[PDB]
């Protein structure tokens, strides 16, 4: 039974150490390429034979090659050929042989790509060691310009931050290496990943431990412009960390930050003095506005005052800057913008050069500054000039809407009614109907002209504009019959399955009658208007179900456009639920079910780091139309919950398989209720086979919330929920994210999993200290939202235990402060919502723990906004007397 294969392999390996490595090694390589019952026995008794191809082979190559660099290349090729089987994971070999053949154990620096690609199943299963990830930084710290090794180190850091939730030396060695590599080195685009690594490792890191060498690195990065990726990453890390730090300091190394901001603004002005260039200029203007926002506005206006593709970019960046920086002044600084852009539209260029000026003006006027008449008259004159210029070609898609939103001038009624030549027409209609229903409906023929002109777009986003177009009649029904007969006639004329105007365009006008008659049964009399749309939509469904051919994007688009349901009670959704469910009950349900059954029957750094992580979102583009049809069918079933039994067969088909079933599992997790135990049981088999290192726990939270909202009958559901929560409660290591769903699913309060019987007390108490700060305290209100007589004392004891656990704990003091004072303040604010506050004891304990020195008066005043002035301080007088508190209580 092939019992001599292992002996032959061992003999060939022993004969190829140093004596006869010319032929025995070739024989071993040929035997490994043949692999007769090798991959099947490696997972059960070929483990030693598979380990000898990485350990014994390396020990033989190091002795044979103890100049002549061909031996290392041959060994690397043999290792790649042995590892290309992809059947096993080789978790034990990936820690020894990879660490021995990597840069850090005279070197060739050739196995870096192999070690980076071999982390498909090794880094996604078990990364507890993470020794190579830390050694890669020290290996790349030298003058060895290896962009591949740098990318591998970045990928290893990302894996350690995602699946391991750890770092090294508090991100100090990486910063010290980047500071020396930014001075004089090569591969700047590969070395610029230090900013991304620090941003990913920002957990439990204050602003003082991140902005220390930030300006020192930015000063050296601003001088070089060879690699734009490193500069972009540095700017992103800056705008993510230093901007937030400056905002917090202004709301509560300032000179270095100001100098860096001034240098960035100077470089931005120099660069300003293409689409990518326009985006860079917009980002630079946003950064300059953020820097000016803690005579800065006047300086910025003078710089802007001192080319249509550049004027348009500047105008777009000005509104973006005014949005990013609140509290805009309406003074001469902003007035100089309108004064300059009043006569901007001089040439025939319709590239929106003059546009966005009225947008920024109306935004500032409605937001803040002053109700000055001069600025209003200037904006009105600019809007009139733009309407006379008639930039309907390109810029009026946003400029006209922004000018109409400035007041709701009215001379554009003819242009809005004749807008058949839809980001412009729908916006103009919404701006004209923004005042009232029949405000701009003075012309009785304007509504008919608009209804006749709207037949040119059928615009998938204009489905909501049907109610705004039908509201202009104001209980008149003048051109309602004409508008209803024009769409039916157009659908009867243009009726094709493989040509344009597919089911999406046919159903885009089906919900228009429900938003006119059913919204303002009511519209159940005109059943022919819905039957025609159903017959037009059922033509491309039954034909595509039996086709199963390539280029099926039309069916996918139709299913994505028809998946707009209600799933609740509202006005626009309440009127559209009839067309979503009653219009198509069983005409296409059976065809969709058959198509789904048939489909079920028959950059790249994320893919290499985790196969499960890749299959989660970016597996492949195959079966995209199938996934879209499945999602549309699930949404239709959820909205309906005739032909309600179609959804029952979909569950047994989706839970039949299973690495390619992740899409079906995620589609089914988003969805009678008592018999839904199959969906919960299928999640356990997937969680048992997964290494819990991917981001599937975030998608599992939706299914957990659905099961908690749904739940003898619920015993199996509770058991499945406990089994799913155990995978993160029993381990409680290297996840750093699964504590968000468990704390949120504690709604409805009544061995290892016995304490989780609808309590979630121990998990919420343990997820406070040994977790990210200011993360678990947001859900503290769910524990005492609706209390009872005994539940009040229970929540008080829980808060006391939490305070006692938080009081038990360089940057350690700054890290414990947001975990001991901010958490206590959040708990007190949550307990002081309705009753059972008991904030006097917390305020007394904060003074003994030096927690009141963090400006607690501001937090108390912010939390007492719903009460009178000093209401808590006046009410705590009866409780402060109960406090070794002769002078400490004062």
Residue 830 token pair: 């949550």
DSSP category for residue 538: T
Give the dihedral of Cα atoms 631, 637, 642, 647; nearest 10 deg.
Answer: 90
Nearest Cα to Cα of residue 128 among 88, 159, 89, 87: 159
**How far is the C-alpha of 229 from the C-alpha of 420, rounded, in Å?**
44
C-alpha distances in Å from residue 252, one per residue of 28, 858, 864, 871: 69, 10, 18, 24
* Contacts for 579 with CB less than 8 Å, ≥ 6 apart: 507, 510, 511, 514, 530
C-alpha distances in Å from residue 319, one per residue of 238, 323, 364: 22, 6, 9
**How far is the C-alpha of 346 from the C-alpha of 703, rounded, in Å?**
58
SS3 assignment, position 435: coil
Within 10 angstroms of residue 205's Cβ, the number of other Cβ atoms is 18
Give the dihedral of Cα atoms 813, 814, 817, 819; nearest 10 deg.
Answer: -100
Resolution value in angstroms: 4.3
DSSP category for residue 546: T
Give 482-498 as a 3 state SS string.
Answer: HHHHHHHHHHHHCCCCC
* Contacts for 462 with CB less than 8 Å, ≥ 6 apart: 422, 425, 426, 454, 508
Nearest Cα to Cα of residue 120 among 608, 696, 617, 659: 608
DSSP category for residue 135: H
**How far is the C-alpha of 674 from the C-alpha of 716, rounded, in Å?**
10
**How far is the C-alpha of 34 from the C-alpha of 639, rounded, in Å?**
55
Give the dihedral of Cα atoms 128, 130, 131, 132; nearest 10 deg.
Answer: 140
Scored b (16 or more CB within 10 A) or e, 173-183 reads ebbebbeebbe
**How far is the C-alpha of 780 from the C-alpha of 774, rounded, in Å?**
11
**How far is the C-alpha of 825 from the C-alpha of 852, rounded, in Å?**
10
**How far is the C-alpha of 202 from the C-alpha of 197, rounded, in Å?**
9
Query: Is-contact 630 596, C-beta < 8 A?
Result: yes
Nearest Cα to Cα of residue 718 among 664, 761, 681, 672: 681
**How far is the C-alpha of 220 from the C-alpha of 508, rounded, in Å?**
55
Give 597-620 as a 3 state SS string.
Answer: HHHHHCCCCCCCCCHHHHHHHCCC
Residue 416 token pair: 């809005």
Nearest Cα to Cα of residue 383 among 369, 399, 365: 399
Scored b (16 or more CB within 10 A) or e, 423-460 reads ebbbbbbbbbbeeebeebbeeeebbebbbbbbeebbee
Burial classification of residue 5, based on how many CB atoms lie within 10 Å of its CB (0-12 exposed, 13-18 middle, 19 or more buried)? middle
Please report how many Cα atoms fall inside a 13 Å half-sphere around the Cα of residue 783, on the Cβ side: 32
Residue 753 token pair: 């999993």
List for the chain the helix, strand, coil content (%; round to 5).
60, 0, 40
**How far is the C-alpha of 738 from the C-alpha of 734, rounded, in Å?**
10
SS3 assignment, position 441: coil
Q: What is the DSSP string of 656-676?
A: ----TTHHHHHHHHT---TTT
Nearest Cα to Cα of residue 741 among 778, 774, 694, 715: 778
User: 280: phi > 0 → left, psi -120 to 50 → alpha, else beta; which?
Assistant: alpha
Query: Is-contact 554 502, C-beta < 8 A?
Result: yes
Give 845-886 as a 3 state SS string.
Answer: HHHHCCCCCCCHHHHHHHHCCCCCCCHHHHHCHHHHCCCCCC
Query: Is-contact 593 650, C-beta < 8 A?
Result: yes
Burial classification of residue 66, based on how many CB atoms lie within 10 Å of its CB (0-12 exposed, 13-18 middle, 19 or more buried)? exposed
* H-helix segments, 641-738: 646-654, 662-669, 677-687, 696-710, 715-729
* Contacts for 849 with CB less than 8 Å, ≥ 6 apart: 807, 820
User: 548: phi > 0 → left, psi -120 to 50 → alpha, else beta; which?
Assistant: left
């Amino acid at each position: 039974s092939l019992v001599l294969n292992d002996l032959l392999i061992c003999c060939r390996q022993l004969e190829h150490d140093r004596a006869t490595e010319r032929k025995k090694e070739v024989e071993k390589f040929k035997r490994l390429i043949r692999d007769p019952e090798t991959i099947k026995h490696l997972d059960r008794d070929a483990v030693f034979r598979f380990l000898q191809k990485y350990i014994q082979k390396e020990t033989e190559c190091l002795r044979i090659a103890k100049k002549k660099m061909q031996e290392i290349s041959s060994l690397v090729k043999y290792f790649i050929k042995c590892a290309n089987r992809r059947a096993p994971r080789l978790k034990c070999q990936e820690l020894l042989n990879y660490i021995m053949d990597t840069v850090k154990d005279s070197n060739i620096l050739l196995k870096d790509i192999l070690s980076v690609r071999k982390y498909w199943c090794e880094i996604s299963q078990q990364q507890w060691l993470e020794l190579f990830s830390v050694y890669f930084r020290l290996y790349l710290k030298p003058s060895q310009d290896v962009h591949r090794v740098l990318v591998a180190r970045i990928i290893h850091a990302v894996t350690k931050g995602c699946c391991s939730q750890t770092d090294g030396l508090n991100s100090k060695f990486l910063d010290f290496f980047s500071k020396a590599i930014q001075c004089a080195r090569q591969e700047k685009s590969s070395s610029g990943l230090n900013h991304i690594l620090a941003a990913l490792t920002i957990f439990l890191k204050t602003l003082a431990v991140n902005f220390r060498i930030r300006v020192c690195e930015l000063g050296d990065e601003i001088l070089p412009t060879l690699l734009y990726i490193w500069t972009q990453h540095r700017l992103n890390d800056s705008l993510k960390e230093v901007i937030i730090e400056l905002f917090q300091l202004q709301i509560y190394s300032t000179k270095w930050r100001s100098i860096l901001y001034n240098l960035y603004d100077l470089l931005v002005n120099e660069i300003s003095h293409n689409i990518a260039v326009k985006e860079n200029l917009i980002e630079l203007m946003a950064d300059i506005c953020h820097q000016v926002f803690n005579p800065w506005l006047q300086i910025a206006t003078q710089l802007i005052s001192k080319l249509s593709p550049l004027l348009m970019i500047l105008s777009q960046l000005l509104p973006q800057q005014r949005h990013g920086e609140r509290t805009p002044y309406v003074l001469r600084c902003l007035t100089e913008v309108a004064l300059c852009q009043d006569k901007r539209s001089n040439l025939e260029s319709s590239q929106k050069s003059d546009l966005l000026k009225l947008w920024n003006k109306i935004w500032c006027i409605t937001f803040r500054g002053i109700s000055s008449e001069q600025i209003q008259a200037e904006n009105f004159g600019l809007l009139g000039a733009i309407i006379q210029g008639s930039l309907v070609e390109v810029d009026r898609e946003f400029w006209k809407l922004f000018t109409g939103s400035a007041c709701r001038p009215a001379v554009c009624c003819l242009t809005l009614a004749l807008t058949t030549s839809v980001k412009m027409g729908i916006e103009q209609n919404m701006c004209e109907v923004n005042r009232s229903f029949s405000l701009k409906e003075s012309i009785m023929k304007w509504l008919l002209f608009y209804q006749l002109e709207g037949d040119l777009e059928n615009f998938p986003h204009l489905v909501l504009e049907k109610i705004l177009v039908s509201l202009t009649m104001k209980n008149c029904k003048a051109a309602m019959n004409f508008f209803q007969s024009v769409p039916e006639c157009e659908h009867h004329q243009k009726d094709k399955e493989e040509l344009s105007f597919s089911e999406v365009e046919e159903l885009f006008l089906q919900t228009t009658f429900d938003k006119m008659d059913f919204l303002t049964f009511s519209v159940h009399q005109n059943l022919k208007e819905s039957l025609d749309r159903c017959l037009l939509g059922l033509s491309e469904q039954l034909l595509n179900n039996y086709s199963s051919e390539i280029t099926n994007s039309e069916t996918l688009v139709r299913c994505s456009r028809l998946l707009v349901g209600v799933l609740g009670c509202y006005c626009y959704m309440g009127v559209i639920a009839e067309e979503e469910a009653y219009k198509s009950e069983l005409f296409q349900k059976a065809k969709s079910l058959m198509q789904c059954a048939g489909e079920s029957i028959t950059a790249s750094f994320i893919k290499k780091p985790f196969d499960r992580g890749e299959v989660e979102s970016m597996e492949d583009d195959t079966n995209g139309n199938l996934m879209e049809v499945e999602d549309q069918s699930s949404m239709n079933l959820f909205n309906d919950y005739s032909q309600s039994t179609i959804g029952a067969i979909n569950p047994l088909a989706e839970e039949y398989l299973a690495a390619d079933i992740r899409r079906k599992l995620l589609m089914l997790i988003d969805s009678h209720l008592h018999m839904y135990l199959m969906l919960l049981k299928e999640l356990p088999g997937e969680e048992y086979p997964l290494p819990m290192e991917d981001v599937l726990e975030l998608l599992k939270p939706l299914s957990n919330v659905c099961s908690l909202y749904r739940r003898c009958k619920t015993i199996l559901n509770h058991v499945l929920h406990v089994v799913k929560n155990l995978g993160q409660s029993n381990m409680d290591s290297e996840n750093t994210r699964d504590a968000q769903g468990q704390f949120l699913t504690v709604i409805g309060a009544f061995k290892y999993i016995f304490s989780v019987r609808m309590a979630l007390v121990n998990c919420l108490k343990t997820l406070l200290e040994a977790d990210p700060y200011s993360k678990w305290a947001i859900l503290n209100v769910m524990g005492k939202d609706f209390p009872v007589n005994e539940v009040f004392t229970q929540f008080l004891a829980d808060n006391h235990h939490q305070v006692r656990m938080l009081a038990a704990e360089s940057s350690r003091l700054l890290k414990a402060l947001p975990l001991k004072l901010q958490q206590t303040a959040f708990e007190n604010a949550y307990l002081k919502a309705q009753e059972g506050m008991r904030e006097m004891s917390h305020s007394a304990e904060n003074p003994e723990t030096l927690d009141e020195i963090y400006n607690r008066k501001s937090v108390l005043l912010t939390l007492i906004a719903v009460v009178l002035s000093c209401s808590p301080i006046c009410e705590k007088q009866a409780l402060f007397a109960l406090c070794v508190k002769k002078v400490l209580e004062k």
